[model samples]
Target: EVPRKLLEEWLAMWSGHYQLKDKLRVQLRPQRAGSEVLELGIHGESDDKLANVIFQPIQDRRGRTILLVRDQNTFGAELRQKRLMTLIHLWLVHRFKAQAVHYVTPTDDNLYQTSKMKSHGIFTEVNQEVGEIIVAEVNHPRIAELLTPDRVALRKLITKEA
Candidate 1:
């Protein structure tokens, strides 16, 4: 059960929101797979076309938001799934920590672009214990080759949805 103080803080953070802890309002996009695991009715839009891979966020005990990625396609390949997960992880971190610029791909696909790449403003910590859900996608330096590039190469950021 959530504590009174934590509820208070949540309310303060979302002061003007109509529902404090509305469940239905939270969108859980459905994967491209099927009616079983993807029963949530979540949807993903790719190239303005709805695609696979559903994103669900839940707050952990340490007050950290952890997103669960679910893929519905039974025949989906292993490497493809891993790539998509990594891409989503990086994309979220990038969107929150940087400003997206407008850019075009080689085929003239209008891409969501970002020039600001840096550490997120807030550190991962809860009562001096380092938060384990640290941003490891866009924020990691080891994956520099995978992230840094002009807009034309932005397609490499995400893999194809199975």
Candidate 2:
């Protein structure tokens, strides 16, 4: 959170948010207990976008490495959001050198309302050790290069749908 936010603020200082001159900037933050979390902030005219890739690149005891790509955006048909979302997942997959992908859809019980959809700042954690859910052990660097040249560029060869 801290690193991405600070870099974003720096990006804004050097460029405007609405019509950004460039969308790439670099920042570093030490993760707790050797576990790292990635946060990305993107701006549009109305709602903004936030994403994270949380997983230890090193394989765990199970001989597998799992990663979670959590995204915050209004449920929609906007092609731009869809395209970029796809890009994020795919690029990360390639960079991570993931072998397979899964799609799991668990329904939400949370109540919904007109205003609830407008809650765009839902970035937080309920203790990082808590349970969650997939990926590879690719050893690649320059990881941030795939987030588009604004975005471009996932999936099974395994099936998951959520």
Candidate 3:
């Protein structure tokens, strides 16, 4: 079992107040040996073990950051099978940006919290083996029309019910 303290730390990192723009600057890197992978729920493996692929943030000379994921399988499996929590992590990463989130698992019933993310102008394209989730650019006029202030409250209610 994961330690209680570790989980608490992870929760605080995600739940604490912060600007969406600042979140884009977060660069989750490869964990060194003996380092903590608290961001990931798994034990003893690298932080890349958090999802179906190992996602590391890279910043170019122009200061544009790109996120890339790789499969954990021996033969390098598809990235679409990422866990729900990890998908949520990626979703939050691109919430306020124009970049597209790659490596999503596609399905007919794929709805993140009842399509709340999709309806918010975040377009998604899913194929059989892979998918991409993208947010609307800042210039999009309708971008202002999508907001979910009660999502946190709804999440609490759902958790209580569950």
Candidate 4:
């Protein structure tokens, strides 16, 4: 047992865990003044994986708040990756009231590859997914407009029930 049943109990406390599709587990981590962490950990069968994405604040002490994204590494597979992103987007927008977010867009092939203004203002548009210099989209109506009914259903499940 390695006396590790208690190890799992310890995990249970840190377990702000949520799952999607299969093998994918998402978690919230400790936060600081600058940002918080989201763990996009997928422990595959007979293999293992762990990754970190960040929720960064784009606000001042003056009460303007927003969230932006960062990653220790990108999620490799596309199958459930898209769904996972949808869930995160919903929570930040609807649940947390983090709707001042302008950091939209999904992929940034041309901008990053050609180094064309690669680090400019990404958080300047609402629907920035058709192109990308910065990655990820934010919110519900935008998601509803772009995604399928199944995707639209995620917001209900992602709701933080009191």
Candidate 5:
């Protein structure tokens, strides 16, 4: 059995270590002018995961703001890539007030990679030709309904357009 003094010393050291870690975390955080802007963080340079994926802004033919997101990090698995894109879409819609999200893919395999959006109640234009980008609007009523927990099943759901 260990002595009471040694146990106390170890506990004190652990507590102090955690405190220092928290202080360093705060010190390492970046300073923002207002709200945080969307950024693509460096892989090894920065530890900020939220800043990853630098989305490029483009205007559609109708002059609507669209965010261009690409999932090029499919090294081994694609689930992570889709999930990250979904999170980025959420941030763009909620934080940056993006009107619509667009993803351009060259082949069928590429287009199928974004199936994660369907699970989130966000619908996409699946009828696009090759080299065409699929788009989903955040402000759509169907999308808003799907974001809630209490909703219909996938098979029974339908999107109404005016």
Candidate 6:
């Protein structure tokens, strides 16, 4: 586990990166500003699992918002990502009252080690699995939940699209 202080700092940073403001509005029904839905990515910083999420301003044809939860960072293990995700899911259910959720993971070492510039516009390890999960757990639970999805179908769709 990260030091509490470091965790807090990372949370703030992660929230900014994932557009937590928008997520709060959607999940909380806040009487606030715009309509753009927020998105998030979370996973370990070590292994072969990943988690991410996406939010849409309105429902898509599938009646589901874009969301993801990836685990493929360069720091931890697959189970670590899963544990964090479970914790995150619980937090979302209890605090935000969201019902639908999804989790996504990547197993390609090349992609994990190659895509170093995460959505936060920072250059970290290209390992998206673990880094994404750790960042999500310590950062913003709402945003984390807003964007998670199980991605085998997504990959299949992509292949078909291609």
Best by lDDT: 5
Q: Give the per-residue Cα lDDT of candidate 1 at 43.
A: 22
Local distance difference test, each candidate: 0.28, 0.31, 0.32, 0.37, 0.42, 0.31
The ten-residue window of minimal lDDT in model 4 covers 113-122
TM-score of each candidate structure, all chains considered together: 0.28, 0.33, 0.32, 0.41, 0.44, 0.24
- What local lDDT does model 3 show for residue 84? 32
lDDT per residue, candidate 4, 68-152, as tens digits?
5544333455333223333334334443445454333344532331122121211223334444524333334544432344533
Over 4 Å off, model 3 = 1-29, 34-39, 42-53, 72-87, 91-98, 102-149, 152-162
Task: Give one digit per residue, the lDDT tens place, for model 2 in 1-162.
Answer: 123444444334333422334454432223344556544335434533333323333344766543443322333233222233333333445445543222221114112211121121111111112232211122223223323333221111001111
What is candidate 6's lDDT per residue for 3-122, written digit by digit as tens? 223322333433444433211111222123573544333433332223433432233476643223332222334323122333233333334333233234444542332232122212
Task: Output the lDDT of residue 88, model 5.
Answer: 35
**Model 1 residue 67 lDDT score:** 42
Candidate 2 stretches greater than 4 Å from native: 1-35, 43-64, 70-81, 100-162
- Once superposed on the true structure, which residue ranges of model 1 sit more than 4 Å away at CA? 1-50, 72-86, 93-139, 142-162
TM-score ranking, best first: 5, 4, 2, 3, 1, 6
Residue-level lDDT for 85 in candidate 3: 39
Assess the local accuracy of residue 57 in candidate 4 as a C-alpha lDDT between 0 and 100. 53
Error of 1 at 116 (Å): 27
